[PDB]
């Protein structure tokens, strides 16, 4: 409910300001970059004395702090598991207030009563699902009740709760600056809001969704997915695998460098149906995939395997196919699929480049012959389309595909 909003930090015509009506002073110092297109984020780094600093000084209010909520979008790169301690958003003055910091895989909200007494709650990201760092946009919501609980949500899901110690002096200043605690990282923020009440589960999820274009598909880091751009296409079940080729088949190989994404072939997404005013990829767009291998441009498309892999299964491969083959055998309908853990998409086989769905793109290990195979079948982990009878796979995580920018 926006009637409780008492701070609203936003980029408006390339100027950070408070749009809430309470007109807090916003000062910008040093290397702060503002994004002129959505989501209109500001960017800070950790290097230099000219490091980047946003000071928000609230105006005449702090008379409304028995319950409050803090909400914002944030992205950190490269947020590695051994990250040193950093304060990033600080509102502490004379040893009381609150603070937001990061260390290792933790983001920590600290409610500071005195120099001696101090409570914190945190979100610790799942390292097993983020081998290359948690470098994706996420939505933080912190709700505090001075006579109740102190909670943190991430992407609208509750993570950590603590009872507040019942007896605090709040600072009028909020300072966005990446300050190390006695290699270089970047930080993006947008839509930093403070509410003068304790938001509940329902309001937080309404808020969460209201700040996104739900039908704009996202890349792995949460930025808008785009046509005519090189990506690494990776399946959620097999994040430790890169795309390769054998014969006319696409095969997935195990990564040598698991702490980043720089292996295998790159795909470019090509629009067939969609909005031409921009380059963004949207749900119900129909599209196809190109990839460049040994300087020859191929396109992804179905092919007949050496043997039947299973009922209703057809493998997806890299073929030198003319546009009419792409239409019949390699056109897809994309739908966004965002989870707490990842920004992904589902891909349905298009009937002749229409929005009519014939199957779903999944993945699996199958034993058959590719390339120069002759005498024996071999196990290959391949992208595979389940035709017609794919109802059980709709909820399956094997149909969740992500796209990591390959610059
Ligand atoms: C049937 C069964 O329970 N088998 C057990 C194994 O289950 C498979 O485990 C492998 C891991 O080695 C995979 O996780 C596989 O899951 C998927 C997958 O590959 O991601 C889900 C996909 O939906 C499915 N694809 C399609 C198109 O349906 C594939 C696919 O069926 C296979 O890849 C084809 O070979 O499978 C699990 O099914 C696993 O628990 C092992 C561990 O011991 O135990 C087997 O008993």
């Amino acid at each position: 409910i926006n009637d409780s909003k008492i701070l609203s930090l936003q980029n408006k015509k390339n100027t950070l300001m408070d749009t809430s009506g309470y007109n807090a002073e916003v000062r910008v110092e040093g290397n702060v970059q503002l994004n002129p297109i959505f989501p209109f984020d500001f960017k800070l780094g950790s290097s230099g004395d000219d490091r980047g600093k946003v000071i928000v000084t609230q105006n005449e209010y702090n008379a409304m702090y028995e319950s409050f909520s803090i909400s914002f979008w944030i992205r950190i790169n490269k947020w590695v598991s051994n990250l040193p301690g950093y304060t990033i958003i600080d509102s502490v003055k004379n040893n009381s207030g609150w603070s937001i910091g990061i260390i290792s895989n933790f983001l920590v909200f600290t409610l500071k009563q005195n120099e001696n007494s101090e409570q914190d709650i945190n979100f610790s990201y799942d390292i097993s699902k983020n081998a290359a760092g948690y470098n994706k946009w996420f939505f933080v919501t912190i709700t505090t009740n001075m006579m109740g609980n102190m909670m943190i949500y991430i992407n609208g899901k509750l993570i950590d709760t603590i009872k507040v110690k019942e007896l605090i002096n709040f600072s009028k200043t909020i300072t966005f600056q990446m300050n190390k605690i006695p290699d270089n990282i970047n930080m993006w923020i947008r839509d930093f809001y403070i509410f003068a009440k304790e938001l509940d589960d329902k309001d937080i999820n309404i808020l969460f969704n209201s700040l996104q274009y739900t039908n704009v598909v996202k890349d792995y880091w949460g930025n808008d997915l785009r046509y005519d751009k090189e990506y690494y296409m990776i399946n959620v079940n097999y994040m430790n695998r890169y795309m390769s080729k054998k014969g006319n088949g696409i095969v997935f190989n195990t990564r040598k460098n698991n702490n980043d994404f720089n292996e295998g072939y790159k795909i470019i997404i090509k629009r067939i149906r969609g909005n031409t005013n921009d380059t963004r990829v949207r749900g119900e767009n129909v599209l196809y995939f190109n990839t460049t291998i040994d300087n020859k441009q191929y396109s992804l498309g179905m092919y007949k395997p050496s043997r039947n892999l299973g009922t209703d299964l057809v493998p997806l491969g890299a073929l030198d196919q003319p546009m009419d083959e792409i239409r019949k055998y390699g056109s897809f309908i994309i739908q966004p699929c965002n989870t707490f853990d990842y920004y992904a998409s589902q891909l349905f086989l298009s009937s002749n480049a229409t929005t009519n769905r014939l199957g779903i793109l999944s993945i699996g290990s199958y034993s058959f012959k590719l390339g120069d195979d002759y005498w024996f079948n071999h196990e290959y982990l391949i992208p595979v389309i389940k035709i017609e009878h794919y109802a059980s796979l709709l909820e399956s995580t094997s149909t969740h595909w992500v796209f990591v920018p390959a610059s």
Side-chain angles (χ1 to χ4, degrees), residues 21-22 25 35 50 88 98 109 118 132 145 209 229 250 260 278 291 299 307 317 330 343 403:
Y22 295 87
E25 177 193 36
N35 184 4
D50 57 331
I88 53 172
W98 58 265
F109 173 76
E118 182 186 292
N145 186 339
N209 294 116
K229 181 178 180 184
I250 288 291
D260 34 40
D278 73 10
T291 178
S299 191
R307 58 175 264 284
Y343 294 98
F403 295 98

mmCIF file with all atom_site columns, all heavy atoms in Angstrom, residues 21-22 25 35 50 88 98 109 118 132 145 209 229 250 260 278 291 299 307 317 330 343 403:
data_model
loop_
_atom_site.group_PDB
_atom_site.id
_atom_site.type_symbol
_atom_site.label_atom_id
_atom_site.label_alt_id
_atom_site.label_comp_id
_atom_site.label_asym_id
_atom_site.label_entity_id
_atom_site.label_seq_id
_atom_site.pdbx_PDB_ins_code
_atom_site.Cartn_x
_atom_site.Cartn_y
_atom_site.Cartn_z
_atom_site.occupancy
_atom_site.B_iso_or_equiv
_atom_site.pdbx_formal_charge
_atom_site.auth_seq_id
_atom_site.auth_comp_id
_atom_site.auth_asym_id
_atom_site.auth_atom_id
_atom_site.pdbx_PDB_model_num
ATOM 1   N N   . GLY A 1 21  ? 7.096  12.434  -1.811  1.00 0.00 ? 21  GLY A N   1
ATOM 2   C CA  . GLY A 1 21  ? 6.360  13.586  -1.301  1.00 0.00 ? 21  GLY A CA  1
ATOM 3   C C   . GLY A 1 21  ? 7.012  14.182  -0.063  1.00 0.00 ? 21  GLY A C   1
ATOM 4   O O   . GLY A 1 21  ? 6.742  15.326  0.280   1.00 0.00 ? 21  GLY A O   1
ATOM 5   N N   . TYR A 1 22  ? 7.886  13.424  0.599   1.00 0.00 ? 22  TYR A N   1
ATOM 6   C CA  . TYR A 1 22  ? 8.554  13.894  1.823   1.00 0.00 ? 22  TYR A CA  1
ATOM 7   C C   . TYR A 1 22  ? 9.882  14.627  1.555   1.00 0.00 ? 22  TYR A C   1
ATOM 8   O O   . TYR A 1 22  ? 10.509 15.150  2.474   1.00 0.00 ? 22  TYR A O   1
ATOM 9   C CB  . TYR A 1 22  ? 8.719  12.738  2.815   1.00 0.00 ? 22  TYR A CB  1
ATOM 10  C CG  . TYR A 1 22  ? 7.380  12.222  3.305   1.00 0.00 ? 22  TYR A CG  1
ATOM 11  C CD1 . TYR A 1 22  ? 6.680  11.236  2.603   1.00 0.00 ? 22  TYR A CD1 1
ATOM 12  C CD2 . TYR A 1 22  ? 6.790  12.753  4.450   1.00 0.00 ? 22  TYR A CD2 1
ATOM 13  C CE1 . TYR A 1 22  ? 5.437  10.788  3.043   1.00 0.00 ? 22  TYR A CE1 1
ATOM 14  C CE2 . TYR A 1 22  ? 5.553  12.308  4.898   1.00 0.00 ? 22  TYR A CE2 1
ATOM 15  C CZ  . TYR A 1 22  ? 4.882  11.327  4.194   1.00 0.00 ? 22  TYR A CZ  1
ATOM 16  O OH  . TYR A 1 22  ? 3.661  10.894  4.645   1.00 0.00 ? 22  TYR A OH  1
ATOM 17  N N   . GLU A 1 25  ? 16.684 15.175  0.991   1.00 0.00 ? 25  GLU A N   1
ATOM 18  C CA  . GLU A 1 25  ? 17.807 15.625  0.191   1.00 0.00 ? 25  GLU A CA  1
ATOM 19  C C   . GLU A 1 25  ? 18.613 14.414  -0.255  1.00 0.00 ? 25  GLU A C   1
ATOM 20  O O   . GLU A 1 25  ? 18.949 13.549  0.559   1.00 0.00 ? 25  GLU A O   1
ATOM 21  C CB  . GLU A 1 25  ? 18.710 16.572  0.987   1.00 0.00 ? 25  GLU A CB  1
ATOM 22  C CG  . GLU A 1 25  ? 19.944 17.024  0.213   1.00 0.00 ? 25  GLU A CG  1
ATOM 23  C CD  . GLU A 1 25  ? 20.986 17.707  1.079   1.00 0.00 ? 25  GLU A CD  1
ATOM 24  O OE1 . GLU A 1 25  ? 21.169 17.301  2.247   1.00 0.00 ? 25  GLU A OE1 1
ATOM 25  O OE2 . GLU A 1 25  ? 21.651 18.638  0.574   1.00 0.00 ? 25  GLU A OE2 1
ATOM 26  N N   . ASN A 1 35  ? 21.591 4.653   -14.979 1.00 0.00 ? 35  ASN A N   1
ATOM 27  C CA  . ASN A 1 35  ? 21.176 3.944   -16.189 1.00 0.00 ? 35  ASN A CA  1
ATOM 28  C C   . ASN A 1 35  ? 20.008 4.674   -16.844 1.00 0.00 ? 35  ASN A C   1
ATOM 29  O O   . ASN A 1 35  ? 18.927 4.754   -16.269 1.00 0.00 ? 35  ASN A O   1
ATOM 30  C CB  . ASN A 1 35  ? 20.763 2.512   -15.830 1.00 0.00 ? 35  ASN A CB  1
ATOM 31  C CG  . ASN A 1 35  ? 20.415 1.671   -17.042 1.00 0.00 ? 35  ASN A CG  1
ATOM 32  O OD1 . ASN A 1 35  ? 20.551 2.106   -18.176 1.00 0.00 ? 35  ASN A OD1 1
ATOM 33  N ND2 . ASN A 1 35  ? 19.959 0.452   -16.797 1.00 0.00 ? 35  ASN A ND2 1
ATOM 34  N N   . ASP A 1 50  ? 37.435 8.256   -5.135  1.00 0.00 ? 50  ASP A N   1
ATOM 35  C CA  . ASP A 1 50  ? 36.284 8.795   -5.864  1.00 0.00 ? 50  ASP A CA  1
ATOM 36  C C   . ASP A 1 50  ? 35.242 7.677   -6.075  1.00 0.00 ? 50  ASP A C   1
ATOM 37  O O   . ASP A 1 50  ? 34.608 7.583   -7.127  1.00 0.00 ? 50  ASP A O   1
ATOM 38  C CB  . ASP A 1 50  ? 36.734 9.377   -7.211  1.00 0.00 ? 50  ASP A CB  1
ATOM 39  C CG  . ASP A 1 50  ? 37.467 8.361   -8.077  1.00 0.00 ? 50  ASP A CG  1
ATOM 40  O OD1 . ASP A 1 50  ? 38.116 7.443   -7.521  1.00 0.00 ? 50  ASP A OD1 1
ATOM 41  O OD2 . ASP A 1 50  ? 37.398 8.485   -9.316  1.00 0.00 ? 50  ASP A OD2 1
ATOM 42  N N   . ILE A 1 88  ? 27.472 -1.504  2.785   1.00 0.00 ? 88  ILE A N   1
ATOM 43  C CA  . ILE A 1 88  ? 26.970 -1.007  1.504   1.00 0.00 ? 88  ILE A CA  1
ATOM 44  C C   . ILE A 1 88  ? 25.868 0.040   1.652   1.00 0.00 ? 88  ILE A C   1
ATOM 45  O O   . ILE A 1 88  ? 25.813 0.973   0.868   1.00 0.00 ? 88  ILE A O   1
ATOM 46  C CB  . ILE A 1 88  ? 26.489 -2.161  0.598   1.00 0.00 ? 88  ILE A CB  1
ATOM 47  C CG1 . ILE A 1 88  ? 25.470 -3.049  1.326   1.00 0.00 ? 88  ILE A CG1 1
ATOM 48  C CG2 . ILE A 1 88  ? 27.684 -2.984  0.139   1.00 0.00 ? 88  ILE A CG2 1
ATOM 49  C CD1 . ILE A 1 88  ? 24.787 -4.093  0.471   1.00 0.00 ? 88  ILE A CD1 1
ATOM 50  N N   . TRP A 1 98  ? 20.495 1.509   11.855  1.00 0.00 ? 98  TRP A N   1
ATOM 51  C CA  . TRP A 1 98  ? 20.558 0.224   11.161  1.00 0.00 ? 98  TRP A CA  1
ATOM 52  C C   . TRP A 1 98  ? 21.586 0.248   10.040  1.00 0.00 ? 98  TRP A C   1
ATOM 53  O O   . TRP A 1 98  ? 21.989 1.307   9.571   1.00 0.00 ? 98  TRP A O   1
ATOM 54  C CB  . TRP A 1 98  ? 19.187 -0.180  10.604  1.00 0.00 ? 98  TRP A CB  1
ATOM 55  C CG  . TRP A 1 98  ? 18.578 0.816   9.645   1.00 0.00 ? 98  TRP A CG  1
ATOM 56  C CD1 . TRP A 1 98  ? 17.685 1.795   9.949   1.00 0.00 ? 98  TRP A CD1 1
ATOM 57  C CD2 . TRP A 1 98  ? 18.819 0.922   8.234   1.00 0.00 ? 98  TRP A CD2 1
ATOM 58  N NE1 . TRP A 1 98  ? 17.356 2.512   8.824   1.00 0.00 ? 98  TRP A NE1 1
ATOM 59  C CE2 . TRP A 1 98  ? 18.037 1.997   7.756   1.00 0.00 ? 98  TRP A CE2 1
ATOM 60  C CE3 . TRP A 1 98  ? 19.619 0.218   7.330   1.00 0.00 ? 98  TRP A CE3 1
ATOM 61  C CZ2 . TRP A 1 98  ? 18.032 2.382   6.415   1.00 0.00 ? 98  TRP A CZ2 1
ATOM 62  C CZ3 . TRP A 1 98  ? 19.614 0.601   5.999   1.00 0.00 ? 98  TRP A CZ3 1
ATOM 63  C CH2 . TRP A 1 98  ? 18.826 1.672   5.553   1.00 0.00 ? 98  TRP A CH2 1
ATOM 64  N N   . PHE A 1 109 ? 21.272 -7.583  7.524   1.00 0.00 ? 109 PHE A N   1
ATOM 65  C CA  . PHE A 1 109 ? 20.635 -6.377  8.046   1.00 0.00 ? 109 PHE A CA  1
ATOM 66  C C   . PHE A 1 109 ? 20.834 -6.338  9.551   1.00 0.00 ? 109 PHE A C   1
ATOM 67  O O   . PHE A 1 109 ? 20.456 -7.269  10.260  1.00 0.00 ? 109 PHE A O   1
ATOM 68  C CB  . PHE A 1 109 ? 19.139 -6.349  7.737   1.00 0.00 ? 109 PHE A CB  1
ATOM 69  C CG  . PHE A 1 109 ? 18.404 -5.213  8.400   1.00 0.00 ? 109 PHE A CG  1
ATOM 70  C CD1 . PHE A 1 109 ? 18.508 -3.920  7.908   1.00 0.00 ? 109 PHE A CD1 1
ATOM 71  C CD2 . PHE A 1 109 ? 17.614 -5.437  9.516   1.00 0.00 ? 109 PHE A CD2 1
ATOM 72  C CE1 . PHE A 1 109 ? 17.833 -2.874  8.516   1.00 0.00 ? 109 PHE A CE1 1
ATOM 73  C CE2 . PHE A 1 109 ? 16.939 -4.397  10.127  1.00 0.00 ? 109 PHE A CE2 1
ATOM 74  C CZ  . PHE A 1 109 ? 17.050 -3.113  9.628   1.00 0.00 ? 109 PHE A CZ  1
ATOM 75  N N   . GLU A 1 118 ? 22.990 -5.160  19.748  1.00 0.00 ? 118 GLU A N   1
ATOM 76  C CA  . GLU A 1 118 ? 22.902 -5.162  18.285  1.00 0.00 ? 118 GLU A CA  1
ATOM 77  C C   . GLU A 1 118 ? 22.379 -6.502  17.773  1.00 0.00 ? 118 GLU A C   1
ATOM 78  O O   . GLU A 1 118 ? 22.896 -7.547  18.160  1.00 0.00 ? 118 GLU A O   1
ATOM 79  C CB  . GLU A 1 118 ? 24.319 -4.930  17.744  1.00 0.00 ? 118 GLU A CB  1
ATOM 80  C CG  . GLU A 1 118 ? 24.502 -4.839  16.245  1.00 0.00 ? 118 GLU A CG  1
ATOM 81  C CD  . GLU A 1 118 ? 25.977 -4.761  15.870  1.00 0.00 ? 118 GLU A CD  1
ATOM 82  O OE1 . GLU A 1 118 ? 26.625 -3.735  16.179  1.00 0.00 ? 118 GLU A OE1 1
ATOM 83  O OE2 . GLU A 1 118 ? 26.498 -5.736  15.286  1.00 0.00 ? 118 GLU A OE2 1
ATOM 84  N N   . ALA A 1 132 ? 29.431 -19.570 -10.005 1.00 0.00 ? 132 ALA A N   1
ATOM 85  C CA  . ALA A 1 132 ? 30.135 -18.401 -10.523 1.00 0.00 ? 132 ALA A CA  1
ATOM 86  C C   . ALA A 1 132 ? 29.826 -17.098 -9.761  1.00 0.00 ? 132 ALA A C   1
ATOM 87  O O   . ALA A 1 132 ? 30.147 -16.015 -10.235 1.00 0.00 ? 132 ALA A O   1
ATOM 88  C CB  . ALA A 1 132 ? 29.840 -18.243 -12.015 1.00 0.00 ? 132 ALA A CB  1
ATOM 89  N N   . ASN A 1 145 ? 9.376  -4.520  13.335  1.00 0.00 ? 145 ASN A N   1
ATOM 90  C CA  . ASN A 1 145 ? 8.393  -4.090  14.318  1.00 0.00 ? 145 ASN A CA  1
ATOM 91  C C   . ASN A 1 145 ? 9.074  -4.007  15.687  1.00 0.00 ? 145 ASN A C   1
ATOM 92  O O   . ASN A 1 145 ? 9.444  -5.028  16.271  1.00 0.00 ? 145 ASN A O   1
ATOM 93  C CB  . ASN A 1 145 ? 7.220  -5.073  14.335  1.00 0.00 ? 145 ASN A CB  1
ATOM 94  C CG  . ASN A 1 145 ? 6.076  -4.618  15.222  1.00 0.00 ? 145 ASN A CG  1
ATOM 95  O OD1 . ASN A 1 145 ? 6.249  -3.793  16.122  1.00 0.00 ? 145 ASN A OD1 1
ATOM 96  N ND2 . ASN A 1 145 ? 4.896  -5.174  14.982  1.00 0.00 ? 145 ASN A ND2 1
ATOM 97  N N   . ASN A 1 209 ? 6.057  -7.938  -7.696  1.00 0.00 ? 209 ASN A N   1
ATOM 98  C CA  . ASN A 1 209 ? 5.619  -8.064  -9.090  1.00 0.00 ? 209 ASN A CA  1
ATOM 99  C C   . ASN A 1 209 ? 5.330  -6.737  -9.779  1.00 0.00 ? 209 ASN A C   1
ATOM 100 O O   . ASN A 1 209 ? 5.580  -6.594  -10.975 1.00 0.00 ? 209 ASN A O   1
ATOM 101 C CB  . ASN A 1 209 ? 4.409  -8.990  -9.185  1.00 0.00 ? 209 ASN A CB  1
ATOM 102 C CG  . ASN A 1 209 ? 4.755  -10.420 -8.820  1.00 0.00 ? 209 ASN A CG  1
ATOM 103 O OD1 . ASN A 1 209 ? 4.253  -10.961 -7.837  1.00 0.00 ? 209 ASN A OD1 1
ATOM 104 N ND2 . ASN A 1 209 ? 5.643  -11.029 -9.599  1.00 0.00 ? 209 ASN A ND2 1
ATOM 105 N N   . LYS A 1 229 ? 22.095 -11.087 -29.735 1.00 0.00 ? 229 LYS A N   1
ATOM 106 C CA  . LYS A 1 229 ? 23.122 -10.966 -28.715 1.00 0.00 ? 229 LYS A CA  1
ATOM 107 C C   . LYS A 1 229 ? 23.615 -12.357 -28.338 1.00 0.00 ? 229 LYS A C   1
ATOM 108 O O   . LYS A 1 229 ? 22.837 -13.312 -28.274 1.00 0.00 ? 229 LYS A O   1
ATOM 109 C CB  . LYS A 1 229 ? 22.573 -10.234 -27.494 1.00 0.00 ? 229 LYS A CB  1
ATOM 110 C CG  . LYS A 1 229 ? 23.588 -10.051 -26.384 1.00 0.00 ? 229 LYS A CG  1
ATOM 111 C CD  . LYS A 1 229 ? 22.999 -9.285  -25.217 1.00 0.00 ? 229 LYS A CD  1
ATOM 112 C CE  . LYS A 1 229 ? 24.025 -9.118  -24.110 1.00 0.00 ? 229 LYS A CE  1
ATOM 113 N NZ  . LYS A 1 229 ? 23.427 -8.454  -22.921 1.00 0.00 ? 229 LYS A NZ  1
ATOM 114 N N   . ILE A 1 250 ? 23.810 -31.451 -30.844 1.00 0.00 ? 250 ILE A N   1
ATOM 115 C CA  . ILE A 1 250 ? 24.317 -30.620 -29.768 1.00 0.00 ? 250 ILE A CA  1
ATOM 116 C C   . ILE A 1 250 ? 24.487 -31.540 -28.581 1.00 0.00 ? 250 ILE A C   1
ATOM 117 O O   . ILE A 1 250 ? 23.567 -32.287 -28.231 1.00 0.00 ? 250 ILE A O   1
ATOM 118 C CB  . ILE A 1 250 ? 23.330 -29.489 -29.379 1.00 0.00 ? 250 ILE A CB  1
ATOM 119 C CG1 . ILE A 1 250 ? 23.296 -28.405 -30.459 1.00 0.00 ? 250 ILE A CG1 1
ATOM 120 C CG2 . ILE A 1 250 ? 23.696 -28.867 -28.035 1.00 0.00 ? 250 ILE A CG2 1
ATOM 121 C CD1 . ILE A 1 250 ? 24.566 -27.576 -30.572 1.00 0.00 ? 250 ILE A CD1 1
ATOM 122 N N   . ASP A 1 260 ? 33.277 -19.829 -13.475 1.00 0.00 ? 260 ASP A N   1
ATOM 123 C CA  . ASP A 1 260 ? 32.730 -18.849 -14.424 1.00 0.00 ? 260 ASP A CA  1
ATOM 124 C C   . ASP A 1 260 ? 32.192 -19.506 -15.692 1.00 0.00 ? 260 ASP A C   1
ATOM 125 O O   . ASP A 1 260 ? 32.268 -20.721 -15.858 1.00 0.00 ? 260 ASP A O   1
ATOM 126 C CB  . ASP A 1 260 ? 33.736 -17.710 -14.727 1.00 0.00 ? 260 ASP A CB  1
ATOM 127 C CG  . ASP A 1 260 ? 35.176 -18.173 -14.734 1.00 0.00 ? 260 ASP A CG  1
ATOM 128 O OD1 . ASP A 1 260 ? 35.453 -19.283 -15.247 1.00 0.00 ? 260 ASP A OD1 1
ATOM 129 O OD2 . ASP A 1 260 ? 36.034 -17.416 -14.227 1.00 0.00 ? 260 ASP A OD2 1
ATOM 130 N N   . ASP A 1 278 ? 11.719 -2.438  -29.958 1.00 0.00 ? 278 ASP A N   1
ATOM 131 C CA  . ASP A 1 278 ? 12.919 -2.731  -29.232 1.00 0.00 ? 278 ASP A CA  1
ATOM 132 C C   . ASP A 1 278 ? 13.406 -4.136  -29.560 1.00 0.00 ? 278 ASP A C   1
ATOM 133 O O   . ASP A 1 278 ? 12.863 -4.828  -30.418 1.00 0.00 ? 278 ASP A O   1
ATOM 134 C CB  . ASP A 1 278 ? 12.672 -2.506  -27.733 1.00 0.00 ? 278 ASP A CB  1
ATOM 135 C CG  . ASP A 1 278 ? 11.802 -3.574  -27.081 1.00 0.00 ? 278 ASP A CG  1
ATOM 136 O OD1 . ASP A 1 278 ? 11.500 -4.628  -27.685 1.00 0.00 ? 278 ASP A OD1 1
ATOM 137 O OD2 . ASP A 1 278 ? 11.412 -3.343  -25.919 1.00 0.00 ? 278 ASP A OD2 1
ATOM 138 N N   . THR A 1 291 ? 23.938 -20.389 -34.082 1.00 0.00 ? 291 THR A N   1
ATOM 139 C CA  . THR A 1 291 ? 25.216 -20.567 -33.400 1.00 0.00 ? 291 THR A CA  1
ATOM 140 C C   . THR A 1 291 ? 26.340 -20.671 -34.426 1.00 0.00 ? 291 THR A C   1
ATOM 141 O O   . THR A 1 291 ? 26.157 -21.249 -35.498 1.00 0.00 ? 291 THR A O   1
ATOM 142 C CB  . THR A 1 291 ? 25.203 -21.797 -32.464 1.00 0.00 ? 291 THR A CB  1
ATOM 143 O OG1 . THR A 1 291 ? 26.488 -21.956 -31.857 1.00 0.00 ? 291 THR A OG1 1
ATOM 144 C CG2 . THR A 1 291 ? 24.835 -23.078 -33.214 1.00 0.00 ? 291 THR A CG2 1
ATOM 145 N N   . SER A 1 299 ? 22.062 -23.281 -37.396 1.00 0.00 ? 299 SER A N   1
ATOM 146 C CA  . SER A 1 299 ? 20.853 -22.972 -36.672 1.00 0.00 ? 299 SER A CA  1
ATOM 147 C C   . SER A 1 299 ? 20.410 -24.224 -35.910 1.00 0.00 ? 299 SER A C   1
ATOM 148 O O   . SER A 1 299 ? 20.668 -25.334 -36.361 1.00 0.00 ? 299 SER A O   1
ATOM 149 C CB  . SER A 1 299 ? 19.805 -22.562 -37.702 1.00 0.00 ? 299 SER A CB  1
ATOM 150 O OG  . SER A 1 299 ? 18.667 -22.013 -37.094 1.00 0.00 ? 299 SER A OG  1
ATOM 151 N N   . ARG A 1 307 ? 18.722 -44.045 -33.674 1.00 0.00 ? 307 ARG A N   1
ATOM 152 C CA  . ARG A 1 307 ? 17.671 -44.952 -33.231 1.00 0.00 ? 307 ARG A CA  1
ATOM 153 C C   . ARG A 1 307 ? 16.620 -44.186 -32.440 1.00 0.00 ? 307 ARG A C   1
ATOM 154 O O   . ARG A 1 307 ? 16.847 -43.052 -32.019 1.00 0.00 ? 307 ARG A O   1
ATOM 155 C CB  . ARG A 1 307 ? 18.253 -46.090 -32.377 1.00 0.00 ? 307 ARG A CB  1
ATOM 156 C CG  . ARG A 1 307 ? 19.023 -45.640 -31.131 1.00 0.00 ? 307 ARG A CG  1
ATOM 157 C CD  . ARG A 1 307 ? 19.486 -46.792 -30.216 1.00 0.00 ? 307 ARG A CD  1
ATOM 158 N NE  . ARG A 1 307 ? 18.585 -47.077 -29.083 1.00 0.00 ? 307 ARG A NE  1
ATOM 159 C CZ  . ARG A 1 307 ? 18.469 -46.359 -27.959 1.00 0.00 ? 307 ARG A CZ  1
ATOM 160 N NH1 . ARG A 1 307 ? 19.187 -45.261 -27.760 1.00 0.00 ? 307 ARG A NH1 1
ATOM 161 N NH2 . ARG A 1 307 ? 17.611 -46.743 -27.015 1.00 0.00 ? 307 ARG A NH2 1
ATOM 162 N N   . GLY A 1 317 ? 19.547 -30.376 -32.616 1.00 0.00 ? 317 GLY A N   1
ATOM 163 C CA  . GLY A 1 317 ? 20.925 -30.314 -33.112 1.00 0.00 ? 317 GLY A CA  1
ATOM 164 C C   . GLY A 1 317 ? 21.301 -29.001 -33.769 1.00 0.00 ? 317 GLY A C   1
ATOM 165 O O   . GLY A 1 317 ? 20.518 -28.068 -33.778 1.00 0.00 ? 317 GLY A O   1
ATOM 166 N N   . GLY A 1 330 ? 12.829 -25.892 -36.202 1.00 0.00 ? 330 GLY A N   1
ATOM 167 C CA  . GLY A 1 330 ? 13.657 -25.166 -35.240 1.00 0.00 ? 330 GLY A CA  1
ATOM 168 C C   . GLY A 1 330 ? 13.114 -23.840 -34.734 1.00 0.00 ? 330 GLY A C   1
ATOM 169 O O   . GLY A 1 330 ? 13.882 -22.985 -34.279 1.00 0.00 ? 330 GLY A O   1
ATOM 170 N N   . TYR A 1 343 ? 16.463 -16.827 -12.939 1.00 0.00 ? 343 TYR A N   1
ATOM 171 C CA  . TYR A 1 343 ? 15.714 -16.256 -14.039 1.00 0.00 ? 343 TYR A CA  1
ATOM 172 C C   . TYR A 1 343 ? 15.857 -17.196 -15.228 1.00 0.00 ? 343 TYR A C   1
ATOM 173 O O   . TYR A 1 343 ? 16.954 -17.365 -15.760 1.00 0.00 ? 343 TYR A O   1
ATOM 174 C CB  . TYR A 1 343 ? 16.281 -14.885 -14.422 1.00 0.00 ? 343 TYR A CB  1
ATOM 175 C CG  . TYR A 1 343 ? 16.125 -13.821 -13.362 1.00 0.00 ? 343 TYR A CG  1
ATOM 176 C CD1 . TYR A 1 343 ? 17.169 -13.512 -12.512 1.00 0.00 ? 343 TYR A CD1 1
ATOM 177 C CD2 . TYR A 1 343 ? 14.930 -13.123 -13.215 1.00 0.00 ? 343 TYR A CD2 1
ATOM 178 C CE1 . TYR A 1 343 ? 17.031 -12.538 -11.537 1.00 0.00 ? 343 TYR A CE1 1
ATOM 179 C CE2 . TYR A 1 343 ? 14.778 -12.145 -12.246 1.00 0.00 ? 343 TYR A CE2 1
ATOM 180 C CZ  . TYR A 1 343 ? 15.837 -11.855 -11.406 1.00 0.00 ? 343 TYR A CZ  1
ATOM 181 O OH  . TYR A 1 343 ? 15.707 -10.893 -10.430 1.00 0.00 ? 343 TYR A OH  1
ATOM 182 N N   . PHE A 1 403 ? 19.975 -18.028 -19.990 1.00 0.00 ? 403 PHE A N   1
ATOM 183 C CA  . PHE A 1 403 ? 20.859 -17.451 -20.988 1.00 0.00 ? 403 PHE A CA  1
ATOM 184 C C   . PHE A 1 403 ? 21.841 -16.500 -20.322 1.00 0.00 ? 403 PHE A C   1
ATOM 185 O O   . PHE A 1 403 ? 21.427 -15.454 -19.827 1.00 0.00 ? 403 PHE A O   1
ATOM 186 C CB  . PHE A 1 403 ? 20.030 -16.717 -22.040 1.00 0.00 ? 403 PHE A CB  1
ATOM 187 C CG  . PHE A 1 403 ? 19.139 -17.620 -22.843 1.00 0.00 ? 403 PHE A CG  1
ATOM 188 C CD1 . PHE A 1 403 ? 17.801 -17.767 -22.517 1.00 0.00 ? 403 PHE A CD1 1
ATOM 189 C CD2 . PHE A 1 403 ? 19.646 -18.330 -23.929 1.00 0.00 ? 403 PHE A CD2 1
ATOM 190 C CE1 . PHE A 1 403 ? 16.982 -18.604 -23.257 1.00 0.00 ? 403 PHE A CE1 1
ATOM 191 C CE2 . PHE A 1 403 ? 18.836 -19.174 -24.671 1.00 0.00 ? 403 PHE A CE2 1
ATOM 192 C CZ  . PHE A 1 403 ? 17.500 -19.310 -24.335 1.00 0.00 ? 403 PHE A CZ  1
#
